[PDB]
Amino acid sequence: VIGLILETDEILNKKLRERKQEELQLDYNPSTGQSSVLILDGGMKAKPYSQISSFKDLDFKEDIEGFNKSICLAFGVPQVLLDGGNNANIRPNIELFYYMT
Amino acid sequence: MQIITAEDYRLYGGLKRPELESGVEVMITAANALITSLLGMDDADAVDQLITTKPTRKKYFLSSPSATSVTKMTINDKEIDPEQYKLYSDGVILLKFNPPEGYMDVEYTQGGFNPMPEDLKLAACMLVDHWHKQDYRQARTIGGETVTFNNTKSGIPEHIRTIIEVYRRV
Amino acid sequence: MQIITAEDYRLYGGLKRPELESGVEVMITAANALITSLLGMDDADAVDQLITTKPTRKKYFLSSPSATSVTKMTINDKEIDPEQYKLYSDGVILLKFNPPEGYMDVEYTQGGFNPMPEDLKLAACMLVDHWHKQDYRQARTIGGETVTFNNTKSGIPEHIRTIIEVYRRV
Amino acid sequence: MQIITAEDYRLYGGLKRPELESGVEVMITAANALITSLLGMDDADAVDQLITTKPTRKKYFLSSPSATSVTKMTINDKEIDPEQYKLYSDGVILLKFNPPEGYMDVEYTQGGFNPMPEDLKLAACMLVDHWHKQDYRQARTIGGETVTFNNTKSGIPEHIRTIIEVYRRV
Amino acid sequence: MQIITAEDYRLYGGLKRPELESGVEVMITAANALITSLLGMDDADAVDQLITTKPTRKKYFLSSPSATSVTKMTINDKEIDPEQYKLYSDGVILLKFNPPEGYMDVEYTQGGFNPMPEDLKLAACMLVDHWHKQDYRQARTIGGETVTFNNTKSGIPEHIRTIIEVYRRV
Amino acid sequence: MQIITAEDYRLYGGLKRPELESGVEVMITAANALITSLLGMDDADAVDQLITTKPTRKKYFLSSPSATSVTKMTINDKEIDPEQYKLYSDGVILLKFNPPEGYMDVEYTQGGFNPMPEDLKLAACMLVDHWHKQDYRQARTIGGETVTFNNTKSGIPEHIRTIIEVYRRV
Amino acid sequence: MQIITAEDYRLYGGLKRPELESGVEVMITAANALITSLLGMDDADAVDQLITTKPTRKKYFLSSPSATSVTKMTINDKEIDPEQYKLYSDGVILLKFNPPEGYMDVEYTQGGFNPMPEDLKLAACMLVDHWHKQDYRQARTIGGETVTFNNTKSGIPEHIRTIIEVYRRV
């Protein structure tokens, strides 16, 4: 994860560059820091980057639910017994499980 | 700072003449001041600073990355023993305890470039040469000879610019 | 570092004159400092560093990729035995144990370019020639002969730029 | 590596004089180092490496595509028999078993270009020619004759660039 | 490969002189190597290859589209009979059975351009002519006569480029 | 193919000299090969091809649009009677039955441009004149006379380009 | 086709000499072929075609808009009486019945431009003039007289281009 990308076309003193990387990261965090405004002097720019691979494309709920349901189907245990439900769901499912399986 | 003075300016070029012209000394001193101003330094024996303190933060940065030592530190009008911090190679200050909220006052002693780098000396010499010979035009032609000067980055030429920006965060 | 000196500068070009003009030595030293500053090195016998330690991380990178050995390491005011880590070919350090949270203090000894590459010497010779002969203009015409110079990448010319950027992370 | 030396440099051009000028040898050695550095190679008898080992992965890549053999291999401080791995034509290493997690330490012997290609020799010779005659300007004219030089790709000219990029991953 | 050599180079131009200059042979051999490298071939009697095998796939491609025959085939350390595959006009290999998963090792014999095409010979001649007469500048003027050279595509000129890209996948 | 040879090349220019310079024959043969390679054709008596067969598809295209006849066809190692298909004016082949899945192997005989069009002859003559007279520069000025050449489409000039692209899918 | 021949070429540009030069006849024949090829025509007495037949479609288009008559028609290997179709002024064919699915085989006699338009003759004459006098450069200066030629559209000049496109779908 990245918060800010700053670009310059000159070789600006690697050591103090890393020091400023630490300083900005510490200062601009609202949990530990009280700064909001940034001034860029000397020609340094800010590249408007985006996020390439996010965690919202990985939607794995339906597949995992399907695998669990299919395993429960294979053994024969009704899903209501594992999850739990109302009385009309509780007792007939218990009878169906015991008898049929 | 004092980067050049007459001896180094003479050594940069070749002057056999008795003495620098009256305008040259002013340009040398002006270059001395402009370079020490551009690199972010400030000529001062001691500097007082307000570094705000939030909890769960134990790493505070001094203004000058070339701070020799901290004479006194005071958080919320309460002095703090020297054993609760130790100043590292850079201006970075590490606090062993958890600082309370409020404001924090530090008095430190600055020292910058005790051995003078030769890059800054060359940059200052070429700056004073830039001012003396009026080489702040886009082009120039005296008879047959034609000269087209370099591009400028924030006014200063490209070479002085690269030297400064190599040293421009102190 | 010390890249060129008078002997190498003489060998690069052809000089039969007895000595090097007073201005040439200053430019040679300036090039020696400027190149070692541009490549990311820092002239220092030993360097103290903060490398923050998070758990389940067992690979920490030293500042200088040319660290010969680590004299001492201290995690949260507690020294670590030399058998819990070993420094690989680069500055990479692997910790056999799981480090606790906090901060780490490591002292190491830098050694850089014991055999000097000829590329850096050639680049420094080109830089000192670039400063000596004022070949930092866009064009120049002395009578019939006209010269148009190369483009500049962050000030330094293209060839010196490519040599540096081949060596510019050490 | 050693690409050119005096004999090949002489054979490229037609020099009949008794000997190469003092500056020419430095340029030849600089080109020899610069090309072998640009092609991604590194002059070293043996190289130690960290390749991260994940399970269900049986194909690990060595840094040098010209690795003759692997002297030893150690995964998580446990040596592995020579019959459990096979080094193919490239640096590709196949593991018959399923490697456990942790880290991998491989020692191999690097050998590159035992018969030296003539393309690299030509590229180095023309780099030496480029440095010797100062053909690193945008344009030039001595009286009637005018010359405008090629475009540059990352500093080096187009032809040397294409030869290098033909060989630029070894 | 050996495309041109002295006889074909002489036939391309008109040399009545006794013997090719010493620099010409090096350029001829360098052109011979660069062309055979740019078209994707690799001088080798036999090549070992890893082609990964997935099920329901019966069509695998050899590296060289000019493979004369396959000496042996091995799928997961199990040799395959010659009757289970047959190599077609190109490097395409058709497997009659369903290959199991894992890796496949194939050893074949390469043969390329037994009748040498005249297009490649002309391209090599014009490349060595390009190197000999230094026709790698944007323009040139010797007195009255002025020449402006062609645009370059990845370094090589347009005509050599089109010939190569006509033959650039072998 | 054989497009030009000495007689047609002579009949274009009109030369009165006894013979064609040794270099001219090589250029003529190179042009003959280059054009027949650019048009997509391939000098071959018979060609073996893989055309994949899906069901409910009864129209398969041969590689060469100038296929005179089909000697043999085999689907999934089973030969097919000549009455189940018939080759039309182009390479298009219609199958009366429904082909099963798998692969198809077809052997056919190519015949290309038995009456040679004059357009290809003119294009080849222009190509050989383009190579002979070094008319592959952007401009040229011999004394008073100046010539500025046409734009290039993938290297070849505009007129040869239009002729080829008129014939460039055979 | 046959557009110009020697008589028309002579009439276009008044000419006194006995006979057209050997190179002129080749250029005339090449232009005659090139124009009739560019206009989409094809020199052939009869053409066989596949037109896909879908139901509820009673209007099928012949390849040549200058088809004089249809000798025979066969849909799905069944001949069709001449009273079931009508060939109108263009290649458009109307079917009174509803054709079944499958494929259609039509044989027609192609005849184009029995009275030769003078626009095509002028275009071919000026193409021959363009080839004969090498007016295929961007500029040309013979002493005082300078000529800058027209822009090109797909190679052929603007005027020939517009004449062709006036007749370019036959």
PDB file of all heavy atoms in Angstrom, chain B residues 63-77:
ATOM      1  N   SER B  63      15.123  20.202  13.461  1.00  0.00           N
ATOM      2  CA  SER B  63      15.074  21.028  12.259  1.00  0.00           C
ATOM      3  C   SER B  63      16.338  20.867  11.423  1.00  0.00           C
ATOM      4  O   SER B  63      16.272  20.761  10.192  1.00  0.00           O
ATOM      5  CB  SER B  63      14.865  22.494  12.642  1.00  0.00           C
ATOM      6  OG  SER B  63      14.847  23.322  11.492  1.00  0.00           O
ATOM      7  N   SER B  64      17.501  20.845  12.071  1.00  0.00           N
ATOM      8  CA  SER B  64      18.778  20.783  11.370  1.00  0.00           C
ATOM      9  C   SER B  64      19.330  19.369  11.418  1.00  0.00           C
ATOM     10  O   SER B  64      19.558  18.837  12.516  1.00  0.00           O
ATOM     11  CB  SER B  64      19.775  21.762  11.984  1.00  0.00           C
ATOM     12  OG  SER B  64      21.102  21.429  11.613  1.00  0.00           O
ATOM     13  N   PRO B  65      19.560  18.725  10.273  1.00  0.00           N
ATOM     14  CA  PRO B  65      20.109  17.361  10.282  1.00  0.00           C
ATOM     15  C   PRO B  65      21.554  17.287  10.756  1.00  0.00           C
ATOM     16  O   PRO B  65      22.149  16.205  10.754  1.00  0.00           O
ATOM     17  CB  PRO B  65      19.994  16.933   8.812  1.00  0.00           C
ATOM     18  CG  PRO B  65      18.913  17.792   8.251  1.00  0.00           C
ATOM     19  CD  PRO B  65      19.074  19.113   8.940  1.00  0.00           C
ATOM     20  N   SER B  66      22.131  18.420  11.163  1.00  0.00           N
ATOM     21  CA  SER B  66      23.535  18.497  11.563  1.00  0.00           C
ATOM     22  C   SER B  66      23.615  19.087  12.974  1.00  0.00           C
ATOM     23  O   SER B  66      24.406  19.991  13.244  1.00  0.00           O
ATOM     24  CB  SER B  66      24.344  19.322  10.563  1.00  0.00           C
ATOM     25  OG  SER B  66      23.951  20.683  10.595  1.00  0.00           O
ATOM     26  N   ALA B  67      22.788  18.565  13.876  1.00  0.00           N
ATOM     27  CA  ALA B  67      22.749  19.003  15.263  1.00  0.00           C
ATOM     28  C   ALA B  67      23.760  18.194  16.063  1.00  0.00           C
ATOM     29  O   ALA B  67      23.678  16.962  16.107  1.00  0.00           O
ATOM     30  CB  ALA B  67      21.346  18.846  15.850  1.00  0.00           C
ATOM     31  N   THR B  68      24.714  18.888  16.689  1.00  0.00           N
ATOM     32  CA  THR B  68      25.759  18.196  17.437  1.00  0.00           C
ATOM     33  C   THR B  68      25.224  17.614  18.740  1.00  0.00           C
ATOM     34  O   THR B  68      25.512  16.457  19.072  1.00  0.00           O
ATOM     35  CB  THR B  68      26.923  19.147  17.717  1.00  0.00           C
ATOM     36  OG1 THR B  68      26.451  20.277  18.460  1.00  0.00           O
ATOM     37  CG2 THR B  68      27.539  19.627  16.412  1.00  0.00           C
ATOM     38  N   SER B  69      24.449  18.391  19.492  1.00  0.00           N
ATOM     39  CA  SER B  69      23.926  17.933  20.772  1.00  0.00           C
ATOM     40  C   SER B  69      22.742  18.802  21.165  1.00  0.00           C
ATOM     41  O   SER B  69      22.538  19.889  20.619  1.00  0.00           O
ATOM     42  CB  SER B  69      25.001  17.968  21.864  1.00  0.00           C
ATOM     43  OG  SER B  69      25.050  19.239  22.487  1.00  0.00           O
ATOM     44  N   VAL B  70      21.966  18.306  22.124  1.00  0.00           N
ATOM     45  CA  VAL B  70      20.803  19.007  22.652  1.00  0.00           C
ATOM     46  C   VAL B  70      21.142  19.459  24.065  1.00  0.00           C
ATOM     47  O   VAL B  70      21.426  18.633  24.940  1.00  0.00           O
ATOM     48  CB  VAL B  70      19.546  18.125  22.636  1.00  0.00           C
ATOM     49  CG1 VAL B  70      18.501  18.666  23.599  1.00  0.00           C
ATOM     50  CG2 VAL B  70      18.982  18.034  21.230  1.00  0.00           C
ATOM     51  N   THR B  71      21.122  20.776  24.291  1.00  0.00           N
ATOM     52  CA  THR B  71      21.454  21.303  25.610  1.00  0.00           C
ATOM     53  C   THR B  71      20.323  21.072  26.606  1.00  0.00           C
ATOM     54  O   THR B  71      20.572  20.674  27.751  1.00  0.00           O
ATOM     55  CB  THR B  71      21.780  22.794  25.516  1.00  0.00           C
ATOM     56  OG1 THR B  71      20.578  23.534  25.271  1.00  0.00           O
ATOM     57  CG2 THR B  71      22.768  23.053  24.390  1.00  0.00           C
ATOM     58  N   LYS B  72      19.080  21.315  26.195  1.00  0.00           N
ATOM     59  CA  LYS B  72      17.948  21.224  27.104  1.00  0.00           C
ATOM     60  C   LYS B  72      16.692  20.866  26.324  1.00  0.00           C
ATOM     61  O   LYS B  72      16.508  21.298  25.184  1.00  0.00           O
ATOM     62  CB  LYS B  72      17.739  22.541  27.863  1.00  0.00           C
ATOM     63  CG  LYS B  72      16.686  22.476  28.961  1.00  0.00           C
ATOM     64  CD  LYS B  72      16.855  23.608  29.962  1.00  0.00           C
ATOM     65  CE  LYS B  72      16.749  24.968  29.290  1.00  0.00           C
ATOM     66  NZ  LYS B  72      15.637  25.023  28.299  1.00  0.00           N
ATOM     67  N   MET B  73      15.830  20.071  26.955  1.00  0.00           N
ATOM     68  CA  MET B  73      14.521  19.736  26.414  1.00  0.00           C
ATOM     69  C   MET B  73      13.469  19.907  27.500  1.00  0.00           C
ATOM     70  O   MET B  73      13.688  19.520  28.652  1.00  0.00           O
ATOM     71  CB  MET B  73      14.491  18.305  25.860  1.00  0.00           C
ATOM     72  CG  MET B  73      13.103  17.818  25.476  1.00  0.00           C
ATOM     73  SD  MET B  73      13.075  16.090  24.970  1.00  0.00           S
ATOM     74  CE  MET B  73      14.689  15.944  24.212  1.00  0.00           C
ATOM     75  N   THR B  74      12.329  20.485  27.128  1.00  0.00           N
ATOM     76  CA  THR B  74      11.259  20.799  28.069  1.00  0.00           C
ATOM     77  C   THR B  74       9.922  20.461  27.426  1.00  0.00           C
ATOM     78  O   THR B  74       9.559  21.043  26.398  1.00  0.00           O
ATOM     79  CB  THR B  74      11.303  22.271  28.480  1.00  0.00           C
ATOM     80  OG1 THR B  74      12.657  22.656  28.745  1.00  0.00           O
ATOM     81  CG2 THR B  74      10.464  22.501  29.724  1.00  0.00           C
ATOM     82  N   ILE B  75       9.192  19.528  28.027  1.00  0.00           N
ATOM     83  CA  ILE B  75       7.858  19.162  27.568  1.00  0.00           C
ATOM     84  C   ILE B  75       6.834  19.676  28.569  1.00  0.00           C
ATOM     85  O   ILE B  75       6.852  19.284  29.744  1.00  0.00           O
ATOM     86  CB  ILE B  75       7.733  17.640  27.387  1.00  0.00           C
ATOM     87  CG1 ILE B  75       8.616  17.165  26.232  1.00  0.00           C
ATOM     88  CG2 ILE B  75       6.283  17.252  27.154  1.00  0.00           C
ATOM     89  CD1 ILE B  75       8.306  15.761  25.761  1.00  0.00           C
ATOM     90  N   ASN B  76       5.940  20.549  28.102  1.00  0.00           N
ATOM     91  CA  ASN B  76       4.881  21.121  28.930  1.00  0.00           C
ATOM     92  C   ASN B  76       5.432  21.751  30.204  1.00  0.00           C
ATOM     93  O   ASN B  76       4.941  21.472  31.302  1.00  0.00           O
ATOM     94  CB  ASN B  76       3.835  20.060  29.275  1.00  0.00           C
ATOM     95  CG  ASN B  76       2.697  20.017  28.277  1.00  0.00           C
ATOM     96  OD1 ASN B  76       2.713  20.721  27.268  1.00  0.00           O
ATOM     97  ND2 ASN B  76       1.696  19.189  28.553  1.00  0.00           N
ATOM     98  N   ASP B  77       6.454  22.597  30.060  1.00  0.00           N
ATOM     99  CA  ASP B  77       7.055  23.324  31.180  1.00  0.00           C
ATOM    100  C   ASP B  77       7.584  22.375  32.252  1.00  0.00           C
ATOM    101  O   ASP B  77       7.477  22.640  33.452  1.00  0.00           O
ATOM    102  CB  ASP B  77       6.066  24.326  31.781  1.00  0.00           C
ATOM    103  CG  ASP B  77       5.768  25.481  30.850  1.00  0.00           C
ATOM    104  OD1 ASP B  77       6.652  25.837  30.042  1.00  0.00           O
ATOM    105  OD2 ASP B  77       4.649  26.033  30.923  1.00  0.00           O
TER     106      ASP B  77
END
